[PDB]
Amino acid sequence: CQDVVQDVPNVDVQMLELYDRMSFKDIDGGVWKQGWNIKYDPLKYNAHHKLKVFVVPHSHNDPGWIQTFEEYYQHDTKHILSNALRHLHDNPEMKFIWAEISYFARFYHDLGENKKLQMKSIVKNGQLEFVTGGWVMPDEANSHWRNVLLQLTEGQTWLKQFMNVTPTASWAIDPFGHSPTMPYILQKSGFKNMLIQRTHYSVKKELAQQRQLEFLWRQIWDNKGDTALFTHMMPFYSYDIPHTCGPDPKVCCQFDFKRMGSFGLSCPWKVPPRTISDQNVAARSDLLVDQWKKKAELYRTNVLLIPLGDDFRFKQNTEWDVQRVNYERLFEHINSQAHFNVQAQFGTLQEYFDAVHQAERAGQAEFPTLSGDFFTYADRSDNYWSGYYTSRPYHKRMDRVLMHYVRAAEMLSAWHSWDGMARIEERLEQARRELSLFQHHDGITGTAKTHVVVDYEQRMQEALKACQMVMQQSVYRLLTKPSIYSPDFSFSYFTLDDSRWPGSGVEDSRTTIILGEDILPSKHVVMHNTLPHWREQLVDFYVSSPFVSVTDLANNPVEAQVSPVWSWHHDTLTKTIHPQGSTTKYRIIFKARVPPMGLATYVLTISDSKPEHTSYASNLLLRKNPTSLPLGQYPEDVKFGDPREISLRVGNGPTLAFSEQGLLKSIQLTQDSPHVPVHFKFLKYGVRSHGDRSGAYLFLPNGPASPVELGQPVVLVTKGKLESSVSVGLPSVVHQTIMRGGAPEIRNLVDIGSLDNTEIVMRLETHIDSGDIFYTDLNGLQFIKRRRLDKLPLQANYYPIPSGMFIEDANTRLTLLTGQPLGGSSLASGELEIMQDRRLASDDERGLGQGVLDNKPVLHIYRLVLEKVNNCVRPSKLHPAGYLTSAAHKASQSLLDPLDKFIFAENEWIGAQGQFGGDHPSAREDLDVSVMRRLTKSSAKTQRVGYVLHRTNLMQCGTPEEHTQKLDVCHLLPNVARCERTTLTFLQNLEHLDGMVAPEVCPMETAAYVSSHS
Ligand SMILES: *[C@@H]1O[C@H](CO)[C@@H](O)[C@H](O)[C@H]1NC(C)=O
Ligand SMILES: N[C@H]1S[C@H](CO)[C@@H](O)[C@H](O)[C@@H]1O
Ligand SMILES: [Zn+2]
């Protein structure tokens, strides 16, 4: 195993170092506005050294953006694919690349058999080539690596099954900024090459000057380079035709033959394309070849890539003809005129890369190595695309919830083979596809029109219901005596109970367990733990009486706490935000202990009076002018008082102090330690009154944030033996700090209501001497070092916070983990901040054609971990990565993959069992079974189950952390007959494993294994 902490990789380009050195001046470079006037030596190419030019036709098809997926499919994409089939079939030399498999699969299944055969033929023969092959071209900022893998696998599995092809070249021309998580997953999925486009215009200029636009992109901690993937970065402002033939768009636009008038398109530069004829072909070729040779100067080989396409292009037959015929005339002339020393032709993406590597092997070029990322993107001036790190936060949070439900549903149902009548595969396929579709760069990014966001939400809602059905049928089968088990596959044996989605104050969706002497004395509940290690976690349920006690299935009492059910109301009469308590529903909370990848059953029983093992929380409402708050049978009366500072401590955990406005002000780790200043504050950013306006994509603040005026907010303090909390009704946010004995959990119910042109930010102020350094994660996979640059505007210093961020000095670190991707930064030493929601009245000129005014209440969740790190073995000052501690990693897992809770629906569960998985190996804490998926239907004689294993890297800080078992996924199911290591998509076998044992992986590595069972 490579050491990912102590050896700083030596690479030719390290992006953080490059950023420290670059000046980012935005000067007018001439026709290439963000570059310079390229010059070339006409004698560079000659008869023995020609410039090979590959013109690659393409069509960017967004799976939803300004129309829904189905609307685009009906209006445009089905015509594009139908005409691509006809045109490629009839013109053997024409080529075309396709990226979005969600659309291709939709099209293909609707084709008649004769056309399906013609389509397979033009793919088999190389005319139509799939690039990447994912369900979509995903966002790379907000997406979790697990979902990037899910969608890649969804599209590639379909391609292998129906087209018999697996792409090894990736095409990502539109995500807004690029992440090294992509080459990481692709290189472990059989890929050999990738292409990217949206990178800061200053980065394009810098790399073009050094001919470093093609590089071997390795991970920031990779000393040896085994994770390296050849990458091609396009050089210009857009992938459209005007910005892909060369540096001068006024000239390139003349070679987009769809722009002469009849198609309703024209050239902004005021010079239109002209049909190629024998009389103008030499002058036209003169111009085009000169653009090509200038573009070729930016690269190292004599093989040149010229994409030819734009959004939803190649729709009409007439368009296919106008582009193909004109380009064929240009190729015939150019290739026959020796003085140009060029051989041009239509080609595919793979053809381009194969030729580039042939040149490389002939010793024609050596490529630089590079590590780092390409955030935050700016396409021009100060227009940094950091707004979409937060836009439509409700769906960004929904993404993480569905991410977990898909994993749990696939894992719970993988243990058994299911009759087709159970519709398990059917429901899982729908769930994977709707979550995969949302990974699109206009989905999770929050950059689609309102009705499209609604479509993605509805799709995700159906996917969550599909996951619930599969999960509850699985639980019933796993915990019922086999000879008693009698399933109705349409019946709901259990209802899922999720205390954080949609969340209290977002949707009253949770069911109350109704108990009563005259109706039902007890209820079974079951918890699932998808993580491969024993786990304890407090769980809560709503119940109809405060007199309830908990037992496990051996009837051992389990300590529990009952608290009221508090709901906050923006009182339109008193103009205050205050909580109301239920007089008929209560919350029962207790510690569940669940086996690795297992289940544990408990029973809640009512009694006529206070149970021996259940305690009741006290409640204190702080506000002037209080009114009574009755709580039905709840045994402790609510107490009142004027606002005042508060201090709380649960168990032996930290002691937290709060201001009289209910916000954290300090954390004391142990009884004797200092009360470390850690203050939460809410602020607001506005929009510029002159100049460019912020919108769904762009964050263009009118200066640093201003504090939100708090007034005299109502603060609710609930103190219990197992859980305490301080909640406060702030304008636009009910902020809650929850304590259960470790790092607190923070929940924000964010309702920006009608506050136009406002972005609400949550900031932490500490005295940690972090200076200009902070860390944020990339796709929940790795933490990368960031350096605040005052030479760049505020919005350029915002980065994606897909799952966590932290600041530290020599002794202290503060880490904020998230349950949803949002944008954030550290704008001053000792600070961390993360945007909660943004409501923007204006469109930001990127094509969406609307502002963001469809905000809805969202419950954002976090864990806040303050720790001493002076004893931790950290990377050196020059290392570009950072790593979490064990506590911070477990806190992240508590947010993204909590225990799942199931409530038995009927009155009696006959044949119920108390536990499942007690014999599953409890793996080391840094190892996770990211995916467990049965790959075969029940009719397969040989069953196959796939596993994706990921080991993160946690800092060594002096904790002995011992006793754990080796996890061999190939022996999790009985009767194993074969164990193979495969690509991460499970599509290719890489290694036949000895003894059918799957070796665990190294820190920061991810491997996939498939076990076969007889
Ligand atoms: C599928 O994969 C390769 C294509 O080159 C070939 O060996 C095989 O015969 C192809 N035919 C199938 C399985 O449809
Ligand atoms: N070409 C881009 S423009 C818009 C960005 O400006 C993007 O969000 C869409 O996904 C399109 O496909
Ligand atoms: Zn797009």
Side-chain angles (χ1 to χ4, degrees), residues 19 60 119 184 247 290 326 415 439 470 472 503 559 646 660 754 804 808 825 831 846 854 897 913 941 950 970:
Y19 259 43
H60 185 68
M119 180 65 85
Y184 179 83
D290 168 72
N326 285 295
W415 296 105
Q439 303 314 303
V470 173
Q472 62 92 13
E559 201 195 328
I646 282 290
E660 74 169 74
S754 65
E808 63 180 4
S825 187
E831 294 181 0
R846 295 307 186 284
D854 52 4
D897 293 281
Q913 303 177 322
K941 182 171 166 54
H950 176 67
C970 270

Side-chain angles (χ1 to χ4, degrees), residues 15 193 237 254 259 318 331 334-335 362 376 422 436 474 483 494 556 571 587 627 686 689 717 721 751 889 899 969:
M15 296 299 297
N193 296 104
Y237 162 81
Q254 297 172 55
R259 303 192 187 227
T318 54
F331 298 156
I334 297 171
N335 300 350
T376 285
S436 289
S474 296
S483 56
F494 297 85
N556 305 313
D571 194 324
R587 277 179 70 239
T627 49
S689 54
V717 182
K721 301 188 57 54
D751 178 8
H889 175 245
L899 297 184
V969 295

Side-chain angles (χ1 to χ4, degrees), residues 60 62 174 441-442:
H60 185 68
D62 293 304
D174 211 34
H441 56 272
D442 295 302

Side-chain angles (χ1 to χ4, degrees), residues 564-629:
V565 173
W566 293 106
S567 63
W568 291 77
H569 296 292
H570 182 155
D571 194 324
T572 203
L573 287 172
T574 59
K575 301 294 181 175
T576 57
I577 301 158
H578 58 107
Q580 290 172 340
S582 167
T583 61
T584 58
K585 301 172 32 171
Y586 305 88
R587 277 179 70 239
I588 184 156
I589 305 153
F590 66 91
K591 183 160 62 181
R593 183 167 172 275
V594 191
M597 298 170 63
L599 301 160
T601 308
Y602 294 81
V603 181
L604 308 195
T605 302
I606 189 171
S607 59
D608 55 37
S609 66
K610 285 194 245 154
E612 171 178 346
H613 299 277
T614 298
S615 61
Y616 296 87
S618 59
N619 298 269
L620 172 62
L621 199 279
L622 305 173
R623 69 127 101 196
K624 285 175 63 178
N625 194 31
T627 49
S628 63
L629 289 167

Side-chain angles (χ1 to χ4, degrees), residues 145 148-149 152 180-190 984:
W145 75 266
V148 169
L149 176 59
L152 175 65
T181 291
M182 299 311 282
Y184 179 83
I185 296 179
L186 299 169
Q187 187 276 330
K188 291 169 161 45
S189 296
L984 303 186

Side-chain angles (χ1 to χ4, degrees), residues 136 464 591 662 759:
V136 300
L464 288 164
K591 183 160 62 181
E759 309 207 26

